């Protein structure tokens, strides 16, 4: 569930938007206080989380949010 | 409430620029279609929601990512 990696838990949210779109999302939360981002994707069958925001990852995690979006809008 | 793509950015600023000291910003991204594209931000008080179609998708994109990235840090 909590897949603490990279390069995993994007491939899974992936397959997880692929099974079904209708019902697939993905909830952002930022913590400026404790300096923490969390994603978090529910699939309404299985939900993912994912905490140590690791700021050198603020780029991978932004692109990831919009390349979700694109394929929401294609 | 369903606010336009060009407050909504201003709105998520002003919202970021809240909970500096205490709360926490969600966003949430979800098909919706009656293609479109709903995204809401909220912190727990004020909630606020808008809907991106593939007319200013590429115009809406390019902001919404700069603002993501500006108002974020962690941990080095």
Same mark, same amino acid.
């Given at each position: 569930?909590?897949?603490?990696?990279?390069?995993?838990?994007?491939?899974?949210?992936?397959?997880?938007?692929?099974?079904?779109?209708?019902?697939? *999302?993905?909830?952002?939360?930022? *913590?400026?206080?404790?300096?923490?981002?969390?994603?978090?994707?529910?699939?309404?069958?299985?939900?993912?989380?994912? *905490?140590?925001?690791?700021?050198?990852?603020?780029?991978?995690?932004?692109?990831?949010?919009?390349?979700?979006? *694109?394929?929401?809008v294609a | 409430?369903?606010?336009? &793509?060009?407050?909504?950015?201003?709105?998520?600023?002003?919202?970021?620029?809240?909970?500096?000291? &205490?709360?926490?910003?969600?966003?949430?991204?979800?098909?919706?279609?009656?293609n479109k594209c709903?995204?809401?931000?909220?912190?727990? !008080?004020?909630?606020? &929601?808008?809907?991106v179609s593939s007319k200013e998708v590429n !115009?809406?994109?390019?902001?919404? &990512? +700069?603002?993501?990235?500006? +108002?974020?840090?962690?941990?080095?």
């Amino acid at each position: 569930a909590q897949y603490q990696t990279w390069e995993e838990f994007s491939r899974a949210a992936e397959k997880l938007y692929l099974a079904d779109p209708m019902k697939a *999302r993905v909830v952002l939360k930022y *913590r400026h206080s404790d300096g923490s981002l969390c994603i978090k994707v529910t699939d309404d069958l299985v939900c993912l989380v994912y *905490r140590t925001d690791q700021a050198q990852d603020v780029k991978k995690i932004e692109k990831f949010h919009s390349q979700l979006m *694109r394929l929401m809008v294609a | 409430v369903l606010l336009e &793509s060009e407050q909504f950015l201003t709105e998520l600023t002003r919202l970021f620029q809240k909970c500096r000291l &205490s709360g926490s910003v969600f966003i949430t991204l979800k098909k919706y279609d009656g293609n479109k594209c709903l995204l809401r931000a909220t912190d727990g !008080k004020k909630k606020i &929601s808008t809907v991106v179609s593939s007319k200013e998708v590429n !115009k809406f994109q390019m902001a919404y &990512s +700069n603002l993501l990235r500006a +108002n974020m840090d962690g941990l080095k």
